[PDB]
Amino acid sequence: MKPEIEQELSHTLLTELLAYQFASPVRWIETQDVFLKQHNTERIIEIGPSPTLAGMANRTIKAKYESYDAALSLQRQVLCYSKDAKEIYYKP
Amino acid sequence: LPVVEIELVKPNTIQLSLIEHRTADTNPVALPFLYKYNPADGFAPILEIMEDRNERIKEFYWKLWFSVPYSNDINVEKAILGDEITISSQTISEFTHAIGNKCDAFVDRPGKATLAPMDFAIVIGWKAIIKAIFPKSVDGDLLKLVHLSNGYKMITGAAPLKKGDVVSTKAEIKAVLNQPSGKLVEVVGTIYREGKPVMEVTSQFLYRGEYNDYCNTFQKVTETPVQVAFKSAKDLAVLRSKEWFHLEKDVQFDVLTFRCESTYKFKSANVYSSIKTTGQVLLELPTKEVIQVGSVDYEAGTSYGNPVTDYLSRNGKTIEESVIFENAIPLSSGEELTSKAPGTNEPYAIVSGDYNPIHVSRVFAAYAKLPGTITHGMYSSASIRALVEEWAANNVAARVRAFKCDFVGMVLPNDTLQTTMEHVGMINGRKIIKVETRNVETELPVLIGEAEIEQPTTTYVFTGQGSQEQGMGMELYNSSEVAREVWDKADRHFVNNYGFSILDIVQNNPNELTIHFGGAKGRAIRDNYIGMMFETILKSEKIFKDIDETTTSYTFVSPTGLLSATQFTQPALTLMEKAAYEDIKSKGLIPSDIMFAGHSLGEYSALSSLANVMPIESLVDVVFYRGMTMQVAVPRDELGRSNYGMVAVNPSRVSATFDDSALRFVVDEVANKTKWLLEIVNYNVENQQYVAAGDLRALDTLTNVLNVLKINKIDIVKLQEQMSIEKVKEHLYEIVDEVAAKSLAKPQPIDLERGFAVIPLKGISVPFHSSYLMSGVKPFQRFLCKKIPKSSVKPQDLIGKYIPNLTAKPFELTKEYFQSVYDLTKSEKIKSILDNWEQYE
Amino acid sequence: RTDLLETADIRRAVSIESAIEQKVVNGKVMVEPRANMKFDFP
Q1: Contact (Cβ atoms closer than 8 angstroms) between residue B785 and residue B778
Q2: Which of A51, B116, B231, B523 has a CA positioned 20 to 30 A from the CA of residue B437?
């Protein structure tokens, strides 16, 4: 793929995504599947004033990926900028 | 077998031939040392023939190492091409057992792609790298050769070496110097796989002695990129005065970055025969990207220094990509980190191909005057990088990256060494770790080095609306300079263009805020407010219908605070997230291959923070614009109250049987039966959280329907099992009709009552992520197209790393992905792109 | 005034940096007066 055509298609797709996402229903289930199972992400970072997404990611991995994490030996570390800033910046 | 053979080859000539049998072909090879015997003077009856001494030692070392015919007629500035070698499990096994690496990634297992250690890079490239010190123009005593430092550097996006890889090596000599201690030689060996670089191996060698051949010395220094900002025309004039500055543009304000490399040539120790400094002059764009706007080109003959580097150091600031955090963290500095040098150096010599006799032969070490058959410095490096790969990583081969190491001391066989490493800093998401090894018996550093290991696979998720709080991000605003920059740029744009301070709103959260339109700046701000339009389907109703040419002010109204307002909440939250992420970037905690996503507004914040698709000013402008657009999207009452809202429900709290499918079915059947908007907007954590939006009548209807299910203990799936789908519809329609007849009584606006499973999301009146806003989405698409510049959209920051809120799959530029987007949007532009895709590619 | 200052200061800065560049590329002592006390007979 040429860089110019790739940039064209990426711009069009990004614009369509941002346009249609605020009216289409948010599919956070597949996003959680992506960043928990497909990518096997041992570290989750959430940035915000409060941990609204960190908590629900925590209970998602608890309800769905507990045995998965056990068997694969995945030590998930869910971190929020509000509370776990020391872990974010590696300042124990 | 014979290791020394002494004879009188001719009268007054004693050959001391040092034999070596640990060779490549197993044939013995001699190192002659001719000695004039002088009967005339008995004080010094032996005179060493220094003649061809170094050439003879080089021939012997060449027979030992190389494979290649003896030919020292190699240009020092040329590139050495190594032999093509295919990686084999047997070779990795031998190498790992030699250096003591027990990592799982390098042991053959079923159903696993056995990998090879990065220390195998020196084995692959030993021929090319060590061929660099042989040429005549780099002359010295190879027996006095000292390996000063060695290091590896993986290329970004390049996977580690693995079994079956057919790999070639290229080697170049970066610098040859004459220092008081001896002659320095710098070699860089690039590892090529399938025609692409896989990594680089840096090596430094010292030829101890005195050398005056300055004509053969050179240096290629990659000068660090220096940042300079122009706050006045004086800087512009000073730079334009420089003959080496090739820019051709106006740079008032602006910030340049000089990615420069300097090539040197020496005539003496302190005077440079020539200097050639050239570089890319990049300019920082509003999107934080750096684009080459010019070049540095400086050439000089006899010179005493580098004026380009001198001026840049004095006037600019070094970027310093490596970032050291507050306090070094011990990283298993202790007894368990002890590494023991091998009893013999034969296995490492055999596997690596480095047959230097000072490691294996006692006679050659004694001649070289070094203390015994010391272990390979490369063995030490690999053995301690095994400790790094074991402890700093988790036997994870993805973490093997740039590993610098310096052989400061010396290690004997059967030597116990107390390695110590601590996480000290960070570089572009990789964890910089000092590695220091000191022998236990004497406690002197023998190895000192740096290691770069990737953080665990990370995704930077970004928060959506509802979490806003007063004074959010302030502590970081006071502490971190980059957070100051983000917040100040945003705030100053806000005051200049809309006439209010987002920092003031966040800090104070004023109940009322009056924007005044006096003076020319007031007229410009009023013009911005007037030009703000809500386009829909094509209607063009204005957001601020009560602002016109004759109005002197406009007042924002909130019940308790304006920070809760959509137009000020969204920029404030986007900005706190952007500032936190930018401070994190300044600290270098962003792995290159991160993932990222975000919840509603968090998506825009994430894209700005990671992909940098927009500048801070444009980001805040668009989020403010769409916040006001969402404010005017819903017809409000006389007191700014609409008939729309959001409620977060829990099927598990309704009952264990009630699932996402049951909640959905109830939602669509309520909407269809009552002819009112009601949909599930957010599909959060399964069976625990689901946000729904619609007409407030329908939201209350859903509340009471789920309450009825909670109390009566009736399961939709059970009904589906025990009667036909039509009868299930009829039952749920009976429930919905009862509740709808009740909802008719509830007058507008309806204050929702917290149910068993449903909780109202207070402070929200827009039903967003619903079919309601599809009318505004298309004009919002046009707005996004104009406000997101095409050149600023970098796919490399998105492909396989961006999980869009719409599709919830890794972002990809493929026909399948575009087809999914059409499946979710019904967009004809996507179909034009899909149909033309074959021509596009 | 600003034209004159923006000329003088840029000339001074260019001179300073040219001097520094020359110093990088290339790597009088006054007499200290002291008292000559005489009596100065006629």
Answers
A1: no
A2: B116
Interchain CB distance below 8 Å, B233 and C13: no
Strand partners, B189: B171, B201
CA-based nearest residue to B117, from B425, B393, B322? B393
Taking a C-beta distance cutoff of 8 angstroms, is the pair B203, B215 a contact? no
Which residues 1-30 on chain B approach chain A with CB closer than 8 angstroms?
Answer: none
- How far apart are the C-alpha atoms of A74 and A69, rounded to whole Å? 5
CB–CB of B241 and C17 under 8 A? yes
CATH fold, domain B636-763, is: Alpha-Beta Plaits (3.30.70)
Interface residue B741 vs chain C (CB under 8 A): no
Instruction: Name the class of domain B511-560.
Output: special
Gaps in chain C after residue (C–N beyond 2.5 Å): 27
Instruction: Classify domain B805-841 at the CATH topology level.
Output: Helix Hairpins (6.10.140)
Alpha helices in B404-480 (DSSP H): 474-479
CB proximity A57 to B under 8 Å: yes
Contact B660, B683 (CB under 8 A): yes
User: How near does any CA of chain B get to the CA of A92, in Å?
Assistant: 8
The CATH topology of domain B51-209+322-455 is Thiol Ester Dehydrase; Chain A (3.10.129)
Q: Do chains A and C touch (3 or more CB pairs under 8 A)?
A: no
The CA–CA distances, whole Å, from B374 to B24, B358, B409, B412, B682 equal 20, 7, 11, 4, 66
C-alpha closest to that of B668 among B719, B734, B732 = B732
- Which residues, numbered 277 to 306 in chain B, qualify as contacts with chain C under a Cβ-Cβ cut-off of 8 Å? 300, 303-306
Which residues of chain B does C20 touch, with a Cβ-Cβ cutoff of 8 Å? 307, 310-311, 314
Query: Cα separation of B755 and A51, whole Å?
Result: 24
DSSP notation for B153-186: EEPTTPPPPBTT-EEEEEEEEEEEEEETTEEEEE
DSSP string, A35-81: IIIIS--SEEEEESSS-HHHHHHHHHHHHHSHHHHHHHT---EEEET
**B273 catalytic residue (yes or no):** no
Given a contact cutoff of 8 angstroms between Cβ atoms, the answer to whether B577 and B463 are in contact is yes
Whether the CA torsion B136, B138, B139, B145 is positive or negative: it is negative
B414 in Cβ contact with B425 (< 8 Å): no
- Domain topology for B210-321: Lipocalin (2.40.128)
Beta carbons of B304 and C18 less than 8 Å apart: no
